[PDB]
UniProtKB/Swiss-Prot annotation:
This is Serine/threonine-protein kinase pim-1. Proto-oncogene with serine/threonine kinase activity involved in cell survival and cell proliferation and thus providing a selective advantage in tumorigenesis. Exerts its oncogenic activity through: the regulation of MYC transcriptional activity, the regulation of cell cycle progression and by phosphorylation and inhibition of proapoptotic proteins (BAD, MAP3K5, FOXO3). Phosphorylation of MYC leads to an increase of MYC protein stability and thereby an increase of transcriptional activity. SUPFAM superfamilies: Protein kinase-like (PK-like). InterPro entries: Kinase-like_dom_sf, PIM1/2/3, PIM_Ser/Thr_kinase, Prot_kinase_dom, Protein_kinase_ATP_BS, Ser/Thr_kinase_AS. The gene is PIM1. Changing residue 50 to K: Decreased kinase activity.
Length: 273
């Protein structure tokens, strides 16, 4: 009954993830996003408790969707002969962080601190639920403009979190760590911290630090606008070439730069309204 349960609105975007449309749940007028993924384009499959074979994203979103978190919720899913359709939460009004940075430029540090903090909390939640995102980036963060609340999207490159080495990767290369580039090997948490360093740089500078593999491997960061000494230190720590030299999530959240974070509502009042 997909076609009767949802009224389809405009296409929001398309890309490697599939095609995502604005929609409304007709029963209660709930705003949703409707994500279509072609079966031929799914490399990574999971299985539900009842035996049903599904995209990994469905498995991972179910693992994280219990209680509140900074993760966009899976509301329902449908199988068609050549595709899966996922029904996702849709804040309104909303803008992805890539579009936000593109429009507004480099973020003020107070704003970046609030956003970065919320991303860390959401990533911690995923990890606590046994899920590794593997594609943390501005394009995969939604901002609820009224509430100042950030939500993670697109678990299509994700995996079950494990303590042994990953030798597969299908996330975004420019957010991928040097050990992936050089050895095609990474561990989950330390690779996540690398991507968070890329993200933080992106927030405070308005662009990502590395384009080419050679730049990633060299790992040297330069600043084109004024960024505080403490923020620069945190970025450079997250981007340590050796995975063991990177901070843990606890170390990031205890860093001097991360102190005195604004709550989401205050963040929206100051920066978004
Ligand atoms: N609610 C919701 C839920 C979403 C997504 C968007 C919204 Cl609004 N998207 C993003 C679609 C592309 C964006 C749209 C805006 C313009 N810039 C490009 C997803 C992309 C991939 N996997 C899950 C997604 O889930």
């Amino acid at each position: 009954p997909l076609e009767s349960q949802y009224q389809v609105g405009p296409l929001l975007g398309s890309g490697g993830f599939g095609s995502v449309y604005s929609g409304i749940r007709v029963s209660d007028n709930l705003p949703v996003a409707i994500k279509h993924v072609e079966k031929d384009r799914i490399s990574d499959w999971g299985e539900l408790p009842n035996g049903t074979r599904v995209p990994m994203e469905v498995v991972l979103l179910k693992k994280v969707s219990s209680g509140f978190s900074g993760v966009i919720r899976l509301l329902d899913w449908f199988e068609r002969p050549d595709s899966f359709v996922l029904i996702l939460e849709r804040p309104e009004p909303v803008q992805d962080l890539f579009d936000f940075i593109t429009e507004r430029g480099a973020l003020q540090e107070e704003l970046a601190r609030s956003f970065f903090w919320q991303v860390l909390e959401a990533v911690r939640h995923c990890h606590n639920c046994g899920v590794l995102h593997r594609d943390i980036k501005d394009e995969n963060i939604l901002i609820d403009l009224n509430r100042g609340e950030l939500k993670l999207i697109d678990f299509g490159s994700g995996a079950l979190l494990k303590d042994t080495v990953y030798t597969d990767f299908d996330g975004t290369r420019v957010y991928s760590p040097p050990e992936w580039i050089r050895y095609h090997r990474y561990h989950g948490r330390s690779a996540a911290v690398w991507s968070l360093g890329i993200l933080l740089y992106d927030m405070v500078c308005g662009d990502i630090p590395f384009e080419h593999d050679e730049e990633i491997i060299r790992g040297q960061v330069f600043f084109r606008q004024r960024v505080s000494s403490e923020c620069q230190h945190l970025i450079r720590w997250c981007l340590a070439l050796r995975p063991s030299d990177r901070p843990t999530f606890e170390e990031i959240q205890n860093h001097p730069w991360m102190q005195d974070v604004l709550l989401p509502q205050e963040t929206a009042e100051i920066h978004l309204h």
